[PDB]
């Protein structure tokens, strides 16, 4: 009775999996920790709800994960490994390798004061390599839900990360879901109802990397109008050539007699472009809240390279927004 599978700690499925506990829940269903007796290892089992819409998303996730696993690059190891899938008690079950804390858990463990720029750079370098993998023409996968929660440590005392959850994903040119991206990480082009490509994931990554170092969301909107207003505080009014083509431009902006755009009033924001990323990152003032003052690996030069890469990932124009190959060549990553 209901969407969920009933799970009692202690049960053993198909005399292969011993169920230990429920790690977590989500929109899609349940994740349980279990021991795979034939592979001799812990696995995370994603149990999809018995409902057409969740079954359908999971069936795309299986196809995209099996497509990615076919590739013979080392870059594929930045994406969670789907061991197996099977039907059991009327639920699609996806058997994953067992990973560790998500990046949101990391932030919580720092009490939301942020991780070091040194660890930020290691996460950024791996995420740019994962996005470069996804942009493989034969893949051309848009994750569509990048957020700190969907990026997991492989092991709790190492820097190595992987991306999870391709439930909302599509391939270049597809339009499947009415709304896409988690609101804090949602690109201007999705807010504006414009066509979206792999650049929307680069937008999400920019936002994620700032949060990981400051401890707080860059753009914490409570609704789409609040989201776009918080973006404008930092980045200014979007270019006219974008707003002139945007189906939902008039949800956030008004075009003036001159042909200049500015913000609609809502019916309490800093003037456009005056909440500088330079001051959010504390480039010249000791990093976020001054907390990194003196500390090694937190110099003005380091911060300027970080700021400059983030602003290339947060370009309003998805045609000119930095692409994964060029992001990897950035001075921020030089040894
Ligand atoms: C030790 C604590 C558990 C670590 C872990 N290993 C995981 C492996 C895969 C997935 C996962 C994969 C996909 N494609 N979609 C979702 N939604 C979750 N999730 C994992 N998790 C997180 C637990 C889920 C709350
Ligand atoms: Cl709204």
Helix/strand/coil (H/E/C) assignment for every residue in the chain:
CCCCCCCCCCCEECCCEEEEEEEEEECCEEEEEEEECCCCEEEEEEEECCCHHHHHHHHHHHHHHHHHHCCCCHHHHHECCEEEEEEECCEEEEEEECCCCEHHHHHHHCCCCCCCHHHHHHHHHHHHHHHHHHCCCCCCEECCCCCHHHEEECCCCCCCEEECCCCCCEECCCCCCCCCCCHHHCCHHHHCCCCCCCHHHHHHHHHHHHHHHHCCCCCCCCCHHHHHHHHHHHHCCCCHHHHCCCCCHHHCEEECCCCCEEECCCCCCCCCCCCCHHHHCCCCCCCHHHCCCCCCCCCHHHHHHHHHHHHHHCCCCCCCCCCHHHHHCCHHHCC
Q: How many C-beta neighbours within 10 Å does residue 201 have?
A: 27
In a domain, residue 110? The reply is yes
Q: Tell me if 143 sits within 8 A of 132, measured CB to CB.
A: no
Residue whose CB lies within 8 A of the most ligand 1 atoms, among 19, 20, 23, for a mutation test: 23
Closest ligand, as measured to the CA of 264 = 2
Question: Are residue 121 and residue 196 in the same domain, yes or no?
Answer: yes
Taking the C-alpha atoms of residue 146 and residue 163, their distance in angstroms, rounded to an integer, is 8
In a domain, residue 2? The reply is no
Question: According to the 3-state scheme, what is the secondary structure of 244-279?
Answer: CCCCCHHHCEEECCCCCEEECCCCCCCCCCCCCHHH
Last residue of a domain, one of 73, 98, 123: 98
User: What resolution does the deposited structure have, in angstroms?
Assistant: 2.1
In a domain, residue 164? The reply is yes
Taking the C-alpha atoms of residue 170 and residue 126, their distance in angstroms, rounded to an integer, is 21
Question: Are residue 198 and residue 306 in the same domain, yes or no?
Answer: yes
Residue whose CB lies within 8 A of the most ligand 1 atoms, among 80, 95, 103, 162, for a mutation test: 80
In a domain, residue 255? The reply is yes
Last residue of a domain, one of 61, 82, 98: 98
Task: Kindly report the protein residue whose alpha carbon is nearest to atom 25 of ligand 1.
Answer: 24
Last residue of a domain, one of 98, 128, 147: 98
Known binding residue 30? Answer is: yes
Question: Are residue 189 and residue 248 in the same domain, yes or no?
Answer: yes
Task: Report CA(226)–ligand 2 centroid distance (Å).
Answer: 7
**Which residues contact residue 254 at a Cβ distance below 8 angstroms, ignoring those fewer than 6 apart?**
261, 262, 263, 264
CA end-to-end span of the chain: 57
Q: Which of 144, 150, 238, 127 lies closest to 186 in space, CA to CA?
A: 144
Angle between helices 300-313 and 199-214 (to 10 degrees): 150
Domain count, the chain: 2
Q: Which of 183, 189, 309 lies closest to 238 in space, CA to CA?
A: 189
- Measured over the CA atoms of residue 71, residue 74, residue 78 and residue 83, the dihedral's sign is positive
In a domain, residue 5? The reply is no
Out of 15, 20, 72, 145, pick the active-site residue. Answer: 145
Check which CATH number belongs to the domain holding 22 and give it: 3.30.200.20
Known binding residue 24? Answer is: yes
Distances in Å between the alpha carbon of 44 and those of 62, 95, 233, 268?
15, 6, 41, 45
Residue 248 backbone phi and psi in degrees, to 5: -110, 20
In a domain, residue 287? The reply is yes
- Measured over the CA atoms of residue 155, residue 157, residue 158 and residue 160, the dihedral's sign is positive
259 conformational bin, left if phi > 0, alpha if psi -120 to 50, beta if neither: left
Pick the atom of ligand 1 nearest to 61's CA. 14
**Which residues contact residue 66 at a Cβ distance below 8 angstroms, ignoring those fewer than 6 apart?**
82
| Ligand 1 binding site (Cβ under 6 Å of any ligand atom) | 23-24, 26, 31, 44, 46, 80, 96, 98-100, 152, 164-165
Taking the C-alpha atoms of residue 284 and residue 298, their distance in angstroms, rounded to an integer, is 10
Q: How many C-beta neighbours within 10 Å does residue 20 have?
A: 14
Contacts within 8 Å (CB) and 24+ apart, 186-189: 186/224, 186/227, 187/318, 188/228, 188/231, 188/238, 188/242, 188/316, 189/242, 189/318
Question: Are residue 129 and residue 250 in the same domain, yes or no?
Answer: yes
**Which residues contact residue 301 at a Cβ distance below 8 angstroms, ignoring those fewer than 6 apart?**
none
Question: Are residue 136 and residue 269 in the same domain, yes or no?
Answer: yes
Question: Are residue 224 and residue 311 in the same domain, yes or no?
Answer: yes
Question: Are residue 192 and residue 315 in the same domain, yes or no?
Answer: yes
In a domain, residue 86? The reply is yes
Known binding residue 28? Answer is: yes
Task: Report CA(299)–ligand 1 centroid distance (Å).
Answer: 36
Beta partners for 31? Answer: 24, 46
Dihedral of the CA atoms 183, 186, 190, 196 (nearest 10)? -140
Known binding residue 96? Answer is: yes
Taking the C-alpha atoms of residue 255 and residue 263, their distance in angstroms, rounded to an integer, is 9
Question: Are residue 63 and residue 121 in the same domain, yes or no?
Answer: no
In a domain, residue 6? The reply is no
Taking the C-alpha atoms of residue 21 and residue 118, their distance in angstroms, rounded to an integer, is 35
Question: Are residue 205 and residue 323 in the same domain, yes or no?
Answer: yes
Question: Are residue 51 and residue 108 in the same domain, yes or no?
Answer: no
Residue whose CB lies within 8 A of the most ligand 1 atoms, among 96, 97, 103, 141, for a mutation test: 96
Check which CATH number belongs to the domain holding 198 and give it: 1.10.510.10
Known binding residue 29? Answer is: yes
What b/e sequence results for 259-292 when a residue is b if at least 16 CB atoms lie within 10 Å of its CB, and e otherwise? eebebeeeeeeeebeebebeebbbbeebbbeeeb
Q: Tell me if 3 sits within 8 A of 50, measured CB to CB.
A: yes
Would you say how long the chain is, in residues?
335
Task: Report CA(52)–ligand 1 centroid distance (Å).
Answer: 22
Pick the atom of ligand 1 nearest to 99's CA. 6
Residue 2 backbone phi and psi in degrees, to 5: 110, 180
Dihedral of the CA atoms 282, 287, 288, 291 (nearest 10)? -140
Task: Report CA(329)–ligand 1 centroid distance (Å).
Answer: 31
Q: Tell me if 293 sits within 8 A of 287, measured CB to CB.
A: yes
Dihedral of the CA atoms 183, 189, 195, 201 (nearest 10)? -60
Q: Which of 33, 64, 37, 67 lies closest to 47 in space, CA to CA?
A: 33
Distances in Å between the alpha carbon of 59 and those of 27, 93, 168, 170?
15, 11, 11, 12
**CA max distance for the chain:** 73
- Experiment used for this model: X-ray
Taking the C-alpha atoms of residue 312 and residue 206, their distance in angstroms, rounded to an integer, is 8
**Which residues contact residue 50 at a Cβ distance below 8 angstroms, ignoring those fewer than 6 apart?**
3, 5, 90, 91
Q: Tell me if 188 sits within 8 A of 228, measured CB to CB.
A: yes
Question: Are residue 85 and residue 114 in the same domain, yes or no?
Answer: no
Q: How many C-beta neighbours within 10 Å does residue 45 have?
A: 27
Domain span including residue 141: 102-331
Task: Report CA(191)–ligand 2 centroid distance (Å).
Answer: 10
Question: Are residue 148 and residue 237 in the same domain, yes or no?
Answer: yes
Task: Kindly report the protein residue whose alpha carbon is nearest to atom 13 of ligand 1.
Answer: 165
Taking the C-alpha atoms of residue 304 and residue 297, their distance in angstroms, rounded to an integer, is 13
Does the annotation mark 258 as catalytic? no
């Amino acid at each position: 009775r209901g969407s969920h599978m009933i799970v009692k700690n202690g049960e053993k499925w198909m005399d292969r999996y011993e169920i230990d506990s429920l790690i977590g829940k989500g929109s899609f269903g349940q994740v349980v920790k279990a021991y795979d007796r034939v592979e001799q290892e812990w696995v995370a089992i994603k149990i999809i709800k018995n409902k057409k819409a969740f079954l359908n998303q999971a069936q795309i996730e299986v196809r995209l994960l099996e497509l990615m696993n076919k590739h013979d690059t080392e870059m594929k190891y930045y994406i969670v490994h789907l061991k197996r899938h099977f039907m059991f008690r009327n639920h699609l079950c996806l058997v994953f390798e067992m990973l560790s804390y998500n990046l949101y858990d990391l932030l919580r463990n720092t009490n939301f004061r942020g991780v070091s720029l040194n660890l930020t750079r290691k996460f950024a370098q791996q995420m740019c390599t994962a996005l470069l993998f996804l942009a493989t023409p034969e893949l051309s996968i848009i994750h569509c839900d990048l957020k700190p929660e969907n990026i997991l440590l492989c092991n709790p005392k190492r820097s190595a990360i992987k991306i999870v959850d391709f439930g909302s994903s599509c391939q270049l040119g597809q339009r499947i879901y009415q709304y896409i991206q988690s609101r804090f990480y949602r690109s201007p082009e999705v807010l504006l109802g414009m066509p979206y490509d792999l650049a929307i994931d680069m937008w999400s990554l920019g936002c994620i990397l700032v949060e990981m170092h400051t401890g707080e969301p860059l753009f914490s909107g409570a609704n789409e109008v609040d989201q776009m207003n918080k973006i404008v505080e930092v980045l200014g009014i979007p270019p006219a050539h974008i707003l002139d083509q945007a189906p939902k431009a008039r949800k956030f902006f008004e075009k003036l007699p001159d042909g200049t755009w500015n913000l609609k009033k809502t019916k309490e924001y800093k003037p456009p472009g005056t909440r500088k990323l330079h001051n959010i990152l504390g480039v010249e003032t000791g990093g976020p809240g001054g907390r990194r003052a003196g500390e090694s690996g937190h110099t003005v030069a380091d911060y300027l390279k970080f700021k400059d890469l983030i602003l290339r990932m947060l370009d309003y124009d998805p045609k000119t927004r930095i692409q994964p190959y060029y992001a990897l060549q950035h001075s921020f990553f030089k040894k």
